[PDB]
Design a binder for this molecule. Structure first.
Ligand SMILES: [Cl-]
Ligand SMILES: [Cl-]
Ligand SMILES: [Cl-]
Ligand SMILES: [Cl-]
Ligand SMILES: [Cl-]
Ligand SMILES: [Cl-]
Ligand SMILES: [Cl-]
Ligand SMILES: [Cl-]
Ligand SMILES: [Cl-]
Ligand SMILES: [Cl-]
Ligand SMILES: [Cl-]
Ligand SMILES: [Cl-]
Ligand SMILES: [Cl-]
Ligand SMILES: [Cl-]
Ligand SMILES: [Cl-]
Ligand SMILES: [Cl-]
Ligand SMILES: [Cl-]
Ligand SMILES: [Cl-]
Ligand SMILES: [Cl-]
Ligand SMILES: [Cl-]
Ligand SMILES: [Cl-]
Ligand SMILES: [Cl-]
Ligand SMILES: [Cl-]
Ligand SMILES: [Cl-]
Ligand SMILES: [Cl-]
Ligand SMILES: [Cl-]
Ligand SMILES: [Cl-]
Ligand SMILES: [Cl-]
Ligand SMILES: [Cl-]
Ligand SMILES: [Cl-]
Ligand SMILES: [Cl-]
Ligand SMILES: [Cl-]
Ligand SMILES: [Cl-]
Ligand SMILES: [Cl-]
Ligand SMILES: [Cl-]
Ligand SMILES: [Cl-]
Ligand SMILES: [Cl-]
Ligand SMILES: [Cl-]
Ligand SMILES: [Cl-]
Ligand SMILES: [Cl-]
Ligand SMILES: [Cl-]
Ligand SMILES: [Cl-]
Ligand SMILES: [Cl-]
Ligand SMILES: [Cl-]
Ligand SMILES: [Cl-]
Ligand SMILES: [Cl-]
Ligand SMILES: [Cl-]
Ligand SMILES: [Cl-]
Ligand SMILES: [Cl-]
Ligand SMILES: [Cl-]
Ligand SMILES: [Cl-]
Ligand SMILES: [Cl-]
Ligand SMILES: [Cl-]
Ligand SMILES: [Cl-]
Ligand SMILES: [Cl-]
Ligand SMILES: [Cl-]
Ligand SMILES: [Cl-]
Ligand SMILES: [Cl-]
Ligand SMILES: [Cl-]
Ligand SMILES: [Fe+2]
Ligand SMILES: [Fe+2]
Ligand SMILES: [Fe+2]
Ligand SMILES: [Fe+2]
Ligand SMILES: [Fe+2]
Ligand SMILES: [Fe+2]
Ligand SMILES: [Fe+2]
Ligand SMILES: [Fe+2]
Ligand SMILES: [Fe+2]
Ligand SMILES: [Fe+2]
Ligand SMILES: [Fe+2]
Ligand SMILES: [Fe+2]
Ligand SMILES: [Fe+2]
Ligand SMILES: [Fe+2]
Ligand SMILES: [Fe+2]
Ligand SMILES: [Fe+2]
Ligand SMILES: [Mg+2]
Ligand SMILES: [Mg+2]
Ligand SMILES: [Mg+2]
Ligand SMILES: [Mg+2]
Ligand SMILES: [Mg+2]
Ligand SMILES: [Mg+2]
Ligand SMILES: [Mg+2]
Ligand SMILES: [Mg+2]
Ligand SMILES: [Mg+2]
Ligand SMILES: [Mg+2]
Ligand SMILES: [Mg+2]
Ligand SMILES: [Mg+2]
Ligand SMILES: [Mg+2]
Ligand SMILES: [Mg+2]
Ligand SMILES: [Mg+2]
Ligand SMILES: [Mg+2]
Ligand SMILES: [Mg+2]
Ligand SMILES: [Mg+2]
Ligand SMILES: [Mg+2]
Ligand SMILES: [Mg+2]
Ligand SMILES: [Mg+2]
Ligand SMILES: [Mg+2]
Ligand SMILES: [Mg+2]
Ligand SMILES: [Mg+2]
Ligand SMILES: [Mg+2]
Ligand SMILES: [Mg+2]
Ligand SMILES: [Mg+2]
Ligand SMILES: [Mg+2]
Ligand SMILES: [Mg+2]
Ligand SMILES: [Mg+2]
Lengths: 174, 174, 174, 174
């Protein structure tokens, strides 16, 4: 009943709201990782800044869904942002493994939303996901996988020198 | 079993490897056309350079598939690059006609890969083909068709002055 | 019977075509190494880019032989480009050892071509090889040998930290 | 008996003087072609300027041999510069065919001088010919052959429009 609404199924509107929540959840998990690596007894600053930036990017993903919802005439409905699964993240390897799984969880939700949009014959929503979300996921999943391979090569979790070197050379100097 | 792999069917992985080979094959055919037009008894330099650039572009298409394969967690598998169908290319008209058919053959393979990706519900691969390959083919097919029309207008194959003028005015001065 | 042909033996013409094929073969082998180091379970980006550049350089070597053939009035004859000997390259040390042997194989073929050119009293072809090919081989063979020495010093194949450091410090940052 | 002379055979000294004369002869022939195409009843200005530049380049080739002779401690001995074989050059095709044969005659003399230098074990003279003369000949022979192919394609000698177009598009605008 929005004056702009056209070819936008209620199911897709609802699924966009759920996806928005998941983006915010992902942002919050990354924020927790930032704070962990900033601890004085962890002290891997470039890794911390990597996760801070990851958090900001997820927040941007969320805001883009809010804007999308309104563009199509749907209505943003917010729910609680659940706290992350862990309060402490072990080390760079454990955190990167959790990040990989988080990005794959987000990717699966996006793929599921694409299936729904396809089922409801919504090519605009399909294009939006393909053009703004799906390649970002593939690229970041590859980046994080590459990191994990290098962390293993560097002898994580046991090799502290390896972990130190990863922070200096693999992630952006901040 | 790659840690990055998600929603990537074995059939699509294999078809990407076959497509990679076809891009390399197309590159090699264009390289042969370059060398032919550079012969002292052919001596159409702008036409030669046109095909040299076509060859480099196909090589870039191939490299982009290699990168894609790895991004999705598939594994690049290479096969022999078959030599071109001809050792000599007749004249500018015959070569352009062969180029048109080559670009249409490549296009059909890309369309077939899109059908497979659609069947396997792989929207990332669909988007990749649509965003990076399919429009390039339509544009180049149109360009080459336009050239063939002009070569016929110029009296090819019999009209040597027509062929000379095409090289001076239709293809980029190199 | 080309109008430009002068002092160019049929044997040399044929050997130039065979050398052209070998340059293309070398290019393809280096392309395979690039793709291997770009895998998410290998993930040595600077090493990957090193081999990508090696591949492009071999392609340039091939194109220079095509141009040479035509300049002398010979005729380019292409054959299949055989796929590389391996589908996977083990690690940076194994790949560099294979690269060393590849560059020495190419060098031996160039030296053999120089012997033929000398036998047929073709000083232009001798000069072409000496001025455009032979020093490139000596320089690259030295570079790759130096790399292998450093990879051994760094404890390859067992020392993953050593391999990580080589990628950061020995090859160009890409 | 020159104080600088070392490893310079009398035969090579004499052959350098004969080569010098041939370069001057080639210059003079090209000058005649320039004057012919500048005639009001020929009037192909870009072709005329092409041959004028060819003439100046041969003069530079001659001067470089004079300098070489003195560098090695030989003595420049000059002979008459014979007038060209023709007083009129027919048309662009006939002139280009004569230019091709002239450049091949010069090339054969250079190759013969290289054989002599090789026989007398004079690597400096071999290098001088290879580095300063032999590639220039191959390149110019290819250029002129390419021109002849295009003149034939353009319908020379009968097709006056073809000849006009060659002057506008194949040779440098002067
Ligand atoms: Cl609606
Ligand atoms: Cl509709
Ligand atoms: Cl609805
Ligand atoms: Cl909702
Ligand atoms: Cl709950
Ligand atoms: Cl977790
Ligand atoms: Cl915890
Ligand atoms: Cl997760
Ligand atoms: Cl957007
Ligand atoms: Cl995207
Ligand atoms: Cl990327
Ligand atoms: Cl990495
Ligand atoms: Cl370790
Ligand atoms: Cl890294
Ligand atoms: Cl999968
Ligand atoms: Cl899925
Ligand atoms: Cl599968
Ligand atoms: Cl395969
Ligand atoms: Cl086969
Ligand atoms: Cl064909
Ligand atoms: Cl053929
Ligand atoms: Cl085809
Ligand atoms: Cl891309
Ligand atoms: Cl495209
Ligand atoms: Cl267009
Ligand atoms: Cl056109
Ligand atoms: Cl016609
Ligand atoms: Cl015109
Ligand atoms: Cl056109
Ligand atoms: Cl010959
Ligand atoms: Cl000879
Ligand atoms: Cl022969
Ligand atoms: Cl051959
Ligand atoms: Cl075979
Ligand atoms: Cl091997
Ligand atoms: Cl293998
Ligand atoms: Cl080898
Ligand atoms: Cl060169
Ligand atoms: Cl070199
Ligand atoms: Cl050096
Ligand atoms: Cl080194
Ligand atoms: Cl070690
Ligand atoms: Cl450093
Ligand atoms: Cl080093
Ligand atoms: Cl002496
Ligand atoms: Cl001596
Ligand atoms: Cl003597
Ligand atoms: Cl003398
Ligand atoms: Cl006389
Ligand atoms: Cl004559
Ligand atoms: Cl005469
Ligand atoms: Cl002559
Ligand atoms: Cl000099
Ligand atoms: Cl030279
Ligand atoms: Cl050249
Ligand atoms: Cl030309
Ligand atoms: Cl005609
Ligand atoms: Cl024009
Ligand atoms: Cl031309
Ligand atoms: Fe970022
Ligand atoms: Fe991310
Ligand atoms: Fe996200
Ligand atoms: Fe990212
Ligand atoms: Fe292009
Ligand atoms: Fe193309
Ligand atoms: Fe292509
Ligand atoms: Fe194109
Ligand atoms: Fe390089
Ligand atoms: Fe190399
Ligand atoms: Fe090479
Ligand atoms: Fe090199
Ligand atoms: Fe010139
Ligand atoms: Fe010349
Ligand atoms: Fe000369
Ligand atoms: Fe020249
Ligand atoms: Mg209203
Ligand atoms: Mg609703
Ligand atoms: Mg949820
Ligand atoms: Mg709770
Ligand atoms: Mg995109
Ligand atoms: Mg983005
Ligand atoms: Mg990367
Ligand atoms: Mg694994
Ligand atoms: Mg499979
Ligand atoms: Mg195939
Ligand atoms: Mg075959
Ligand atoms: Mg597009
Ligand atoms: Mg493109
Ligand atoms: Mg157009
Ligand atoms: Mg002929
Ligand atoms: Mg032969
Ligand atoms: Mg071979
Ligand atoms: Mg085989
Ligand atoms: Mg020598
Ligand atoms: Mg030399
Ligand atoms: Mg050199
Ligand atoms: Mg070089
Ligand atoms: Mg060095
Ligand atoms: Mg004295
Ligand atoms: Mg004497
Ligand atoms: Mg003489
Ligand atoms: Mg006389
Ligand atoms: Mg040179
Ligand atoms: Mg020069
Ligand atoms: Mg040219």
């Amino acid at each position: 009943v929005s004056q702009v609404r056209q070819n936008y199924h209620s199911d897709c509107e609802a699924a966009v709201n759920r996806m928005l929540n998941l983006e915010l959840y992902a942002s919050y998990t990354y924020s927790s990782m930032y704070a962990f690596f900033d601890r004085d007894d962890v002290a891997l600053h470039n890794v911390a800044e990597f996760f801070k930036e990851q958090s900001h990017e997820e927040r941007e993903h969320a805001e883009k869904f809010m804007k999308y919802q309104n563009k199509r005439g749907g209505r943003v409905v917010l729910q609680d942002i659940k706290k992350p699964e862990r309060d402490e993240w072990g080390n760079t390897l454990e955190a990167m493994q959790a990040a990989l799984q988080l990005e794959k969880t987000v990717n699966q939700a996006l793929l599921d939303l694409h299936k729904l949009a396809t089922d409801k014959v919504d090519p605009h929503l399909c294009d939006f996901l393909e053009s703004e979300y799906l390649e970002e996921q593939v690229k970041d999943i590859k980046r994080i996988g590459d990191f994990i391979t290098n962390l293993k090569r560097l002898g994580l979790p046991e090799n502290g020198m390896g972990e130190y070197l990863f922070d200096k050379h693999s992630v952006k100097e901040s």
